[PDB]
Short mmCIF file of C-alpha atoms and ligand atoms in Angstrom, two decimals:
data_model
loop_
_atom_site.label_atom_id
_atom_site.label_comp_id
_atom_site.label_asym_id
_atom_site.label_seq_id
_atom_site.Cartn_x
_atom_site.Cartn_y
_atom_site.Cartn_z
CA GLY A 1087 -12.52 0.23 -24.20
CA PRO A 1088 -12.51 -2.93 -22.06
CA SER A 1089 -15.42 -3.16 -19.61
CA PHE A 1090 -12.82 -3.30 -16.87
CA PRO A 1091 -10.52 -0.28 -16.62
CA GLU A 1092 -6.86 -0.76 -15.57
CA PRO A 1093 -3.88 1.64 -15.70
CA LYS A 1094 -1.92 1.66 -18.87
CA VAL A 1095 1.27 -0.75 -18.47
CA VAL A 1096 4.60 0.39 -19.36
CA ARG A 1097 7.16 -2.74 -19.56
CA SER A 1098 10.96 -2.85 -19.59
CA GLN A 1099 12.42 -3.49 -22.95
CA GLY A 1100 15.47 -5.45 -23.27
CA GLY A 1101 16.11 -5.09 -19.35
CA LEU A 1102 15.56 -1.43 -19.18
CA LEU A 1103 12.43 0.62 -18.25
CA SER A 1104 13.54 4.08 -19.30
CA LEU A 1105 10.62 6.66 -18.71
CA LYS A 1106 10.05 10.26 -18.09
CA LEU A 1107 6.96 10.95 -15.71
CA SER A 1108 5.71 14.41 -15.04
CA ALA A 1109 3.94 15.32 -11.87
CA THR A 1110 1.15 17.82 -13.01
CA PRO A 1111 -2.45 19.24 -12.40
CA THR A 1112 -4.55 17.32 -14.96
CA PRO A 1113 -7.96 17.82 -16.18
CA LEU A 1114 -9.92 14.72 -16.57
CA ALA A 1115 -13.23 12.84 -16.33
CA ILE A 1116 -13.26 10.72 -13.13
CA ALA A 1117 -16.67 8.83 -12.13
CA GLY A 1118 -18.70 10.82 -14.79
CA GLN A 1119 -17.56 14.28 -13.75
CA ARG A 1120 -14.93 16.73 -14.97
CA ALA A 1121 -12.20 17.18 -12.39
CA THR A 1122 -8.57 18.31 -12.11
CA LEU A 1123 -6.50 16.05 -10.18
CA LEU A 1124 -2.62 15.81 -9.62
CA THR A 1125 -1.24 12.96 -11.84
CA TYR A 1126 1.93 11.10 -13.02
CA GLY A 1127 1.79 10.43 -16.51
CA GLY A 1128 -1.41 12.51 -17.08
CA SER A 1129 -3.60 9.57 -15.58
CA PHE A 1130 -5.37 8.46 -12.25
CA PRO A 1131 -3.95 6.15 -11.24
CA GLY A 1132 -0.56 6.84 -12.75
CA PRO A 1133 0.63 4.26 -15.24
CA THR A 1134 1.58 0.63 -13.94
CA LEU A 1135 5.22 -0.04 -14.41
CA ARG A 1136 5.93 -3.89 -15.08
CA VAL A 1137 9.45 -5.09 -14.55
CA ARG A 1138 11.45 -8.07 -14.07
CA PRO A 1139 14.32 -8.88 -11.44
CA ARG A 1140 17.70 -7.52 -12.59
CA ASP A 1141 16.06 -4.69 -14.84
CA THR A 1142 17.37 -1.45 -14.65
CA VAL A 1143 15.00 1.31 -13.84
CA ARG A 1144 15.52 4.83 -14.98
CA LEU A 1145 12.61 7.03 -13.97
CA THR A 1146 13.04 10.89 -14.53
CA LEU A 1147 10.31 12.64 -12.49
CA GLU A 1148 9.51 16.33 -13.63
CA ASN A 1149 7.68 18.38 -10.93
CA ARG A 1150 5.04 20.47 -12.62
CA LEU A 1151 3.31 21.10 -9.31
CA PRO A 1152 3.22 24.56 -7.56
CA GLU A 1153 4.94 22.67 -4.40
CA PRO A 1154 7.93 20.46 -4.15
CA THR A 1155 7.50 16.72 -4.29
CA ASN A 1156 9.50 13.45 -4.53
CA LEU A 1157 9.06 9.88 -5.38
CA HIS A 1158 9.18 6.93 -3.02
CA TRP A 1159 9.20 3.40 -4.23
CA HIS A 1160 7.04 1.82 -1.63
CA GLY A 1161 8.13 -1.86 -0.83
CA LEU A 1162 11.16 -1.93 -3.13
CA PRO A 1163 14.25 -3.38 -1.00
CA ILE A 1164 16.80 -0.81 -2.80
CA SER A 1165 19.21 1.71 -1.41
CA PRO A 1166 17.97 4.71 0.61
CA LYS A 1167 20.32 6.66 -1.37
CA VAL A 1168 18.12 6.13 -4.42
CA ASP A 1169 14.82 5.81 -2.76
CA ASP A 1170 15.61 8.95 -0.82
CA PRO A 1171 12.85 10.10 1.60
CA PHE A 1172 14.48 13.46 2.35
CA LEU A 1173 14.90 14.54 -1.19
CA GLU A 1174 13.01 17.70 -2.37
CA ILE A 1175 12.33 18.15 -5.95
CA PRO A 1176 11.37 22.06 -6.28
CA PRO A 1177 8.63 23.18 -8.56
CA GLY A 1178 9.72 23.10 -12.31
CA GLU A 1179 12.83 20.95 -11.47
CA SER A 1180 13.46 17.17 -12.37
CA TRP A 1181 15.30 14.15 -10.92
CA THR A 1182 16.34 10.73 -12.12
CA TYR A 1183 15.84 7.92 -10.00
CA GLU A 1184 18.14 4.71 -11.38
CA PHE A 1185 18.17 1.41 -9.68
CA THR A 1186 18.44 -2.33 -10.47
CA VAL A 1187 15.49 -4.60 -9.50
CA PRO A 1188 16.60 -7.02 -6.82
CA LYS A 1189 17.20 -10.69 -7.92
CA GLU A 1190 14.90 -12.16 -5.25
CA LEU A 1191 11.83 -10.28 -5.56
CA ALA A 1192 8.26 -10.68 -6.79
CA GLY A 1193 4.79 -8.94 -6.23
CA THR A 1194 2.96 -5.74 -6.37
CA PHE A 1195 4.55 -2.58 -5.09
CA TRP A 1196 3.78 0.96 -5.91
CA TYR A 1197 5.08 4.80 -6.02
CA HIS A 1198 3.86 7.91 -4.64
CA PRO A 1199 4.99 11.10 -3.23
CA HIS A 1200 7.04 11.36 0.16
CA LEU A 1201 7.90 14.81 0.99
CA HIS A 1202 7.15 15.03 4.78
CA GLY A 1203 4.37 17.30 5.89
CA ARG A 1204 2.78 17.26 2.27
CA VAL A 1205 2.29 13.66 1.66
CA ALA A 1206 -1.44 13.41 2.59
CA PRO A 1207 -2.80 16.28 0.18
CA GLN A 1208 -0.55 15.01 -2.70
CA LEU A 1209 -1.50 11.26 -2.56
CA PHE A 1210 -4.99 12.21 -1.97
CA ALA A 1211 -5.16 14.36 -4.94
CA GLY A 1212 -4.22 11.52 -7.20
CA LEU A 1213 -0.34 10.96 -7.23
CA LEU A 1214 0.29 7.21 -7.13
CA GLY A 1215 0.45 4.19 -9.50
CA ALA A 1216 1.58 0.57 -9.40
CA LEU A 1217 4.79 -1.36 -10.04
CA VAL A 1218 4.77 -5.08 -10.65
CA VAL A 1219 7.63 -7.17 -10.40
CA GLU A 1220 7.13 -10.55 -12.71
CA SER A 1221 8.33 -13.57 -11.55
CA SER A 1222 9.37 -17.05 -13.08
CA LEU A 1223 6.60 -18.23 -10.86
CA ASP A 1224 4.17 -16.57 -13.23
CA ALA A 1225 4.89 -19.30 -15.72
CA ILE A 1226 3.42 -22.34 -13.84
CA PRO A 1227 0.24 -23.22 -15.44
CA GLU A 1228 -1.98 -22.66 -12.40
CA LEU A 1229 -1.16 -18.80 -12.70
CA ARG A 1230 -0.25 -18.39 -16.46
CA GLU A 1231 -3.76 -19.72 -17.29
CA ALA A 1232 -5.53 -17.58 -14.74
CA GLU A 1233 -7.14 -14.32 -15.96
CA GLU A 1234 -5.02 -11.40 -14.34
CA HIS A 1235 -6.03 -7.93 -13.23
CA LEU A 1236 -4.73 -5.14 -11.13
CA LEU A 1237 -7.08 -3.55 -8.70
CA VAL A 1238 -5.97 -0.07 -7.30
CA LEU A 1239 -8.21 0.64 -4.41
CA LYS A 1240 -8.28 4.41 -3.81
CA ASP A 1241 -11.15 6.65 -2.67
CA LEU A 1242 -11.68 10.37 -3.22
CA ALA A 1243 -13.75 13.31 -2.62
CA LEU A 1244 -14.39 16.33 -4.77
CA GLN A 1245 -15.27 19.96 -4.16
CA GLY A 1246 -15.49 22.57 -7.06
CA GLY A 1247 -14.04 20.02 -9.32
CA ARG A 1248 -10.85 19.45 -7.39
CA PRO A 1249 -9.90 17.12 -4.37
CA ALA A 1250 -11.56 18.29 -1.44
CA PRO A 1251 -9.07 20.16 0.97
CA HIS A 1252 -8.01 18.70 4.40
CA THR A 1253 -10.10 19.78 7.42
CA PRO A 1254 -8.57 19.81 10.87
CA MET A 1255 -10.59 16.42 11.77
CA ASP A 1256 -8.94 14.95 8.43
CA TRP A 1257 -5.61 15.49 10.01
CA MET A 1258 -6.61 13.61 13.06
CA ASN A 1259 -8.35 10.74 11.37
CA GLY A 1260 -6.71 10.48 7.93
CA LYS A 1261 -8.99 11.63 4.87
CA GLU A 1262 -11.55 9.29 3.49
CA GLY A 1263 -13.68 10.01 0.40
CA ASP A 1264 -17.23 9.32 -0.63
CA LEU A 1265 -16.16 8.16 -4.18
CA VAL A 1266 -14.92 4.61 -3.47
CA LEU A 1267 -13.06 3.73 -6.88
CA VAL A 1268 -11.22 0.85 -8.46
CA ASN A 1269 -8.58 2.01 -10.85
CA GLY A 1270 -10.17 5.37 -10.75
CA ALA A 1271 -13.45 4.00 -11.95
CA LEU A 1272 -16.81 4.00 -9.89
CA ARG A 1273 -18.02 0.47 -9.46
CA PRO A 1274 -16.71 -1.19 -12.70
CA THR A 1275 -17.90 -4.51 -14.02
CA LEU A 1276 -15.64 -7.31 -14.47
CA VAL A 1277 -16.92 -9.64 -17.30
CA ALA A 1278 -14.58 -12.77 -16.43
CA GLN A 1279 -13.57 -14.87 -19.32
CA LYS A 1280 -11.79 -17.52 -17.33
CA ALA A 1281 -12.93 -19.25 -14.26
CA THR A 1282 -9.85 -18.49 -12.45
CA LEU A 1283 -8.91 -14.78 -11.77
CA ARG A 1284 -5.73 -13.63 -10.47
CA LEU A 1285 -6.11 -10.15 -8.66
CA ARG A 1286 -3.48 -7.88 -7.48
CA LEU A 1287 -4.69 -5.76 -5.03
CA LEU A 1288 -3.19 -2.30 -3.73
CA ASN A 1289 -4.69 -0.05 -1.20
CA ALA A 1290 -3.27 3.32 -2.29
CA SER A 1291 -5.88 5.35 -0.07
CA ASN A 1292 -4.60 7.82 2.50
CA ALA A 1293 -6.66 6.19 5.35
CA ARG A 1294 -9.76 4.00 4.13
CA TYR A 1295 -9.51 0.29 4.98
CA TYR A 1296 -10.92 -2.28 2.71
CA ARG A 1297 -12.42 -5.36 4.36
CA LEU A 1298 -12.60 -7.36 1.25
CA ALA A 1299 -15.14 -10.20 0.54
CA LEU A 1300 -16.48 -11.52 -2.49
CA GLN A 1301 -20.03 -12.78 -2.47
CA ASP A 1302 -20.34 -16.48 -2.39
CA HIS A 1303 -16.67 -17.02 -2.73
CA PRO A 1304 -13.55 -17.46 -0.58
CA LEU A 1305 -10.32 -15.78 -1.63
CA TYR A 1306 -7.00 -17.51 -1.98
CA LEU A 1307 -4.15 -15.54 -0.76
CA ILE A 1308 -0.90 -16.16 -2.93
CA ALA A 1309 1.18 -13.04 -2.11
CA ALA A 1310 1.36 -10.48 0.64
CA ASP A 1311 2.95 -6.84 0.41
CA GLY A 1312 6.20 -7.76 -0.86
CA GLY A 1313 6.22 -11.56 -2.21
CA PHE A 1314 4.54 -14.76 -2.54
CA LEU A 1315 3.35 -16.96 0.29
CA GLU A 1316 4.77 -20.40 0.53
CA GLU A 1317 1.50 -21.90 -0.42
CA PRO A 1318 -2.10 -20.47 -1.07
CA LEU A 1319 -3.97 -19.62 1.92
CA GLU A 1320 -7.85 -19.87 1.94
CA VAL A 1321 -9.78 -16.89 3.56
CA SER A 1322 -13.27 -15.90 3.68
CA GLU A 1323 -12.29 -12.19 3.95
CA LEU A 1324 -9.10 -9.98 3.52
CA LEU A 1325 -8.35 -6.74 5.18
CA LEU A 1326 -5.97 -4.30 3.33
CA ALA A 1327 -4.97 -1.28 5.52
CA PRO A 1328 -3.31 1.75 3.68
CA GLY A 1329 -0.14 0.89 1.80
CA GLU A 1330 -0.76 -2.95 1.84
CA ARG A 1331 -0.92 -5.29 -1.10
CA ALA A 1332 -1.98 -8.67 -1.63
CA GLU A 1333 -2.68 -11.14 -4.56
CA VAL A 1334 -5.41 -13.54 -4.61
CA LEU A 1335 -6.69 -16.16 -6.75
CA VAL A 1336 -10.44 -16.24 -7.22
CA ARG A 1337 -12.19 -19.62 -8.29
CA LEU A 1338 -15.48 -18.90 -9.70
CA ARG A 1339 -18.05 -21.54 -8.58
CA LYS A 1340 -21.01 -21.06 -10.80
CA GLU A 1341 -22.56 -18.30 -13.27
CA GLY A 1342 -24.05 -15.13 -12.05
CA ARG A 1343 -23.04 -11.67 -10.89
CA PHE A 1344 -21.15 -11.45 -7.60
CA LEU A 1345 -20.45 -8.16 -5.65
CA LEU A 1346 -16.91 -7.75 -4.44
CA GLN A 1347 -17.44 -5.46 -1.20
CA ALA A 1348 -15.63 -3.61 1.24
CA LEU A 1349 -17.41 -4.61 4.27
CA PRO A 1350 -18.16 -2.58 7.45
CA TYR A 1351 -14.83 -1.94 9.51
CA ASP A 1352 -14.18 0.14 12.42
CA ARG A 1353 -10.51 1.60 12.33
CA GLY A 1354 -11.35 3.86 15.39
CA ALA A 1355 -11.78 7.03 13.36
CA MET A 1356 -13.67 9.77 15.52
CA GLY A 1357 -16.08 12.52 15.12
CA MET A 1358 -16.89 15.44 17.46
CA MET A 1359 -20.18 16.08 19.46
CA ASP A 1360 -22.13 18.25 21.85
CA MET A 1361 -25.03 16.74 23.85
CA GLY A 1362 -25.49 18.51 27.13
CA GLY A 1363 -22.66 20.86 27.25
CA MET A 1364 -19.53 18.67 26.37
CA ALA A 1365 -17.49 19.20 23.29
CA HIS A 1366 -15.84 15.94 22.90
CA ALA A 1367 -14.69 13.08 20.53
CA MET A 1368 -16.91 10.20 19.74
CA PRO A 1369 -16.23 7.03 17.83
CA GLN A 1370 -17.45 7.18 14.19
CA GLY A 1371 -17.94 3.54 14.32
CA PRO A 1372 -17.70 1.08 11.41
CA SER A 1373 -17.47 2.21 7.76
CA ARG A 1374 -20.62 1.61 5.60
CA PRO A 1375 -20.47 -1.23 3.19
CA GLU A 1376 -19.29 -0.38 -0.26
CA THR A 1377 -19.48 -2.14 -3.37
CA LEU A 1378 -16.23 -2.14 -5.23
CA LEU A 1379 -16.82 -3.93 -8.43
CA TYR A 1380 -19.33 -6.25 -10.10
CA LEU A 1381 -17.84 -9.69 -11.01
CA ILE A 1382 -19.69 -11.50 -13.82
CA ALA A 1383 -18.76 -15.33 -13.97
CA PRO A 1384 -18.38 -16.94 -17.43
CA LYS A 1385 -20.52 -19.75 -18.66
CA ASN A 1386 -20.16 -23.11 -16.66
CA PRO A 1387 -16.94 -22.17 -14.98
CA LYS A 1388 -14.10 -24.75 -14.48
CA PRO A 1389 -11.52 -23.27 -12.32
CA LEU A 1390 -7.82 -24.58 -12.51
CA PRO A 1391 -6.57 -26.57 -9.60
CA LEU A 1392 -4.74 -24.30 -7.16
CA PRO A 1393 -0.89 -24.40 -7.26
CA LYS A 1394 0.20 -26.81 -4.51
CA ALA A 1395 3.36 -24.58 -3.74
CA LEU A 1396 4.53 -21.03 -4.49
CA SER A 1397 7.85 -19.81 -3.12
CA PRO A 1398 9.75 -21.06 0.07
CA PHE A 1399 10.19 -18.50 2.47
CA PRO A 1400 14.01 -17.92 3.38
CA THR A 1401 15.29 -19.24 6.65
CA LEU A 1402 16.53 -16.21 8.55
CA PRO A 1403 19.56 -15.97 10.67
CA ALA A 1404 18.84 -15.81 14.46
CA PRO A 1405 18.14 -12.00 15.53
CA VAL A 1406 20.73 -10.05 17.28
CA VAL A 1407 18.66 -7.28 19.04
CA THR A 1408 15.13 -6.64 20.03
CA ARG A 1409 13.57 -3.20 19.65
CA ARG A 1410 10.29 -1.95 21.13
CA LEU A 1411 8.36 0.96 19.24
CA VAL A 1412 5.38 2.30 21.05
CA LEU A 1413 2.67 4.21 19.17
CA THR A 1414 0.64 7.05 20.96
CA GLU A 1415 -1.74 9.67 20.05
CA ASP A 1416 -3.00 13.12 20.91
CA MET A 1417 -6.20 13.28 19.15
CA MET A 1418 -7.28 16.84 20.02
CA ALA A 1419 -3.97 18.17 18.74
CA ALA A 1420 -3.90 15.70 15.87
CA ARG A 1421 -0.41 14.68 16.98
CA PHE A 1422 1.07 11.19 16.86
CA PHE A 1423 4.27 9.90 18.41
CA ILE A 1424 6.45 6.82 18.37
CA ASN A 1425 8.18 6.34 21.76
CA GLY A 1426 7.04 9.79 22.97
CA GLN A 1427 8.62 11.65 20.16
CA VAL A 1428 7.43 13.08 16.79
CA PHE A 1429 9.58 12.98 13.64
CA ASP A 1430 12.80 15.14 13.59
CA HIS A 1431 14.81 14.64 10.27
CA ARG A 1432 18.05 15.41 11.84
CA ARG A 1433 17.49 12.93 14.70
CA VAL A 1434 18.52 9.05 14.32
CA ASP A 1435 16.24 7.09 16.32
CA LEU A 1436 17.57 3.58 15.67
CA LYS A 1437 20.91 2.34 14.49
CA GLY A 1438 21.26 -1.22 13.18
CA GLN A 1439 23.77 -3.29 11.38
CA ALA A 1440 23.47 -4.48 7.82
CA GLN A 1441 22.92 -8.13 7.18
CA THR A 1442 21.80 -8.81 10.66
CA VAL A 1443 18.26 -9.73 11.70
CA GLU A 1444 16.48 -7.60 14.36
CA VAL A 1445 13.21 -8.39 16.25
CA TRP A 1446 10.92 -5.32 16.32
CA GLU A 1447 7.87 -5.17 18.84
CA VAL A 1448 5.65 -2.55 17.53
CA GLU A 1449 2.79 -1.71 20.13
CA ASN A 1450 -0.11 0.31 19.39
CA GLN A 1451 -1.12 2.21 22.67
CA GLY A 1452 -3.60 4.64 20.68
CA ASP A 1453 -7.23 3.87 20.28
CA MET A 1454 -7.03 4.00 16.39
CA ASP A 1455 -5.84 1.34 13.93
CA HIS A 1456 -2.29 2.29 12.68
CA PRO A 1457 -0.56 0.56 9.87
CA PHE A 1458 2.98 0.59 10.67
CA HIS A 1459 5.35 0.84 7.67
CA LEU A 1460 9.28 0.48 7.31
CA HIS A 1461 11.09 1.46 4.32
CA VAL A 1462 14.03 -0.47 2.54
CA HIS A 1463 13.65 -3.67 4.85
CA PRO A 1464 10.92 -5.96 4.37
CA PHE A 1465 9.77 -7.89 7.27
CA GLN A 1466 8.37 -11.18 8.38
CA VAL A 1467 5.36 -10.75 10.73
CA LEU A 1468 5.54 -13.50 13.58
CA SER A 1469 2.31 -12.40 15.36
CA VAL A 1470 -0.14 -9.58 16.06
CA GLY A 1471 -2.12 -9.14 19.05
CA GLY A 1472 -0.74 -12.53 20.59
CA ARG A 1473 -1.80 -14.44 17.53
CA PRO A 1474 0.57 -16.21 15.28
CA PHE A 1475 0.48 -15.20 11.59
CA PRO A 1476 -0.79 -17.97 9.58
CA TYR A 1477 1.75 -17.65 6.75
CA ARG A 1478 5.18 -16.66 5.86
CA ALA A 1479 5.81 -13.78 3.40
CA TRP A 1480 7.57 -10.55 3.04
CA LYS A 1481 5.35 -7.57 4.31
CA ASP A 1482 6.34 -3.79 4.74
CA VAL A 1483 3.19 -2.58 6.13
CA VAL A 1484 1.44 -4.21 9.20
CA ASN A 1485 -1.78 -3.14 10.88
CA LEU A 1486 -2.22 -2.66 14.54
CA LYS A 1487 -5.67 -2.34 16.14
CA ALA A 1488 -5.76 -0.30 19.52
CA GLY A 1489 -3.76 -2.10 22.16
CA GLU A 1490 -2.22 -4.72 19.76
CA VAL A 1491 1.40 -5.73 19.63
CA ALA A 1492 3.03 -6.97 16.37
CA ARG A 1493 6.34 -9.02 16.48
CA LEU A 1494 8.41 -8.60 13.24
CA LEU A 1495 11.53 -10.28 12.11
CA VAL A 1496 13.44 -7.40 10.28
CA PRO A 1497 16.50 -8.37 8.38
CA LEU A 1498 18.45 -5.27 7.62
CA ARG A 1499 19.56 -5.05 4.01
CA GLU A 1500 20.88 -1.78 2.47
CA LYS A 1501 23.03 0.61 4.30
CA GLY A 1502 21.72 4.22 4.82
CA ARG A 1503 19.49 6.42 6.60
CA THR A 1504 15.77 5.66 6.07
CA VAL A 1505 12.42 6.05 7.93
CA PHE A 1506 9.63 4.08 9.56
CA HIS A 1507 6.08 5.60 9.93
CA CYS A 1508 2.35 5.10 10.14
CA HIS A 1509 0.74 4.81 6.76
CA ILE A 1510 -2.16 6.73 7.48
CA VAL A 1511 -0.39 9.53 5.84
CA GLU A 1512 -1.89 12.26 7.68
CA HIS A 1513 -0.46 10.77 11.00
CA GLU A 1514 2.93 10.53 9.11
CA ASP A 1515 2.74 14.30 8.19
CA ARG A 1516 1.73 15.12 11.78
CA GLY A 1517 4.67 13.33 13.29
CA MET A 1518 4.42 9.66 13.55
CA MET A 1519 7.60 8.94 11.99
CA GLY A 1520 11.24 8.03 13.00
CA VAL A 1521 14.64 7.70 11.49
CA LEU A 1522 16.55 4.13 11.09
CA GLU A 1523 20.32 4.23 10.23
CA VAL A 1524 21.80 1.05 8.94
CA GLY A 1525 25.57 0.74 8.64
AG1 LIG B 2551 -12.27 18.15 16.10
AG1 LIG B 2552 -9.03 9.95 16.64
AG1 LIG B 2553 -20.09 12.79 23.46
CU1 LIG B 2554 3.95 4.12 0.71
CU1 LIG B 2555 7.62 3.10 1.87
CU1 LIG B 2556 -1.45 6.31 12.26
CU1 LIG B 2557 7.44 6.21 3.69
O1 LIG B 2558 6.04 5.20 2.52
#
């Protein structure tokens, strides 16, 4: 096929994307070996769903797993009565998600399981895929003329031809794998045909971070998790925590082979040691550098000019409440807390009012990075660790290093009960999650 593997695309037809997807154990070839994974649509990653604002989506998920599951539409500001995090689809049963794509929306989103206590194993085994929302902004020449690709960043470990089981240490750290894949391929080669690339980036890993950098080149950030920036932002590197997305323009500067790498990054994962007589936790330190893909530039590349503007970010009403959410850890028990509590589905932790704006201060008092995620209500990050964010864009995941505080502006949209949680999904399964009710 094409030298560069990307998940098959399913597009809405006449304003309707109607599709049956089975969640199924699936024999396939991955990274040169046979393995059985858990897939949507028979593929790893699952198929990419490409839609437009106002489209109707009708997804019937058939559960062919030996355990219950469900779907979460990560990043979509739609009703929690549709995107229902408490719903359980039993083995053998089916369920139809139906919703309309919001009018003011664009970017890269994704879908994956969200059944509490079983997210980390099901996601790790291969249950995920992307959802792209096309914009009228795609028709401006500086983007239309770029060469577009999706990069699903997701790692894996295999054992006996199946996803490796979670260890006790895995539940504390979040599981990382030794196979560091792009769209399920091991270090694929991208032979560029145009000088400007437009790359949609998705971290669909359980816990691995990707400190992204392309040899000899800057990246031009044009979209965050849930929408475009106001204008392109030049960066020398780009960290993507679990669950985050970004879209970048790449402007190839000369012919040659350039490595896109995940540079060493220390997210505070921990190992166990025994030196004299102690049996305690020790930092793992930085991840080892990984090559993600080989990027071959075309002959005499002349990149397009950058667009001068993208999408103006909405002026939000003044906020009516400030909240404070504190993250802490119990590493040796693999328990994780928000304001001193673990998740309880019966318990409402926050109660807000639709169409008002809130300020959330989320503070990490643990020693690990925690990427904080809120369903249903995209936010604007004002600052993290005392530093102002250098751009305005919708996000739904924000990474917090040890000790850092993030300040977010959270407009409350759809009414209903929903959740917020760390998107190292092992931490989520182990309790680092709470309930928001909007009324
Ligand atoms: Ag241990
Ligand atoms: Ag730890
Ligand atoms: Ag030690
Ligand atoms: Cu998610
Ligand atoms: Cu989500
Ligand atoms: Cu966490
Ligand atoms: Cu979630
Ligand atoms: O999620």
